[PDB]
Design a binder for this molecule. Structure first.
Ligand SMILES: O=C(N[C@H]1CCCNC1)c1ccccc1
Ligand SMILES: [Cl-]
Length: 115
């Protein structure tokens, strides 16, 4: 069901190595619905190539547009298992500190602050 279930560590690593080669300016991001989530829909895909100059505030807006949310639906984004300290951090900086050993940046969204 989850990304890390579906692919061997060898396969995730090799995919990041291909993203680096073919989309060198993009951050490879895995975005996943909280497995206890009631309200929010699932995304059309799992793997995202985010332009590396956008800040976290702009990534939240991209995903709220991808889910087609209205303006008083709630949305919370965990990075690398934990809350974001700030939405002003550029995703290039967040990638460098929060990336997984496989080389993806892992994110989870839910309708409640409680996951
Ligand atoms: O992506 C979704 N719909 C968009 C596609 C682009 C045009 N506007 C509608 C979507 C959102 C939430 C649940 C399921 C699917
Ligand atoms: Cl690129």
């Amino acid at each position: 069901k989850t990304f890390k279930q579906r692919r061997t560590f060898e396969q995730r690593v090799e995919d990041v190595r291909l993203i680096r080669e073919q989309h060198p300016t993009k951050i490879p991001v895995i975005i996943e619905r909280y497995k206890g989530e009631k309200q929010l829909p699932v995304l059309d895909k799992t793997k995202f190539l985010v332009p590396d100059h956008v800040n976290m505030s702009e990534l939240i807006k991209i995903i709220r547009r991808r889910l087609q949310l209205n303006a008083n639906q709630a949305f919370f984004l965990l990075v690398n298992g934990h809350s974001m300290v700030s939405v002003s951090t550029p995703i290039s900086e967040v990638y460098e500190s929060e990336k997984d050993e496989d080389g993806f940046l892992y994110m989870v969204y839910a309708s409640q602050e409680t996951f």
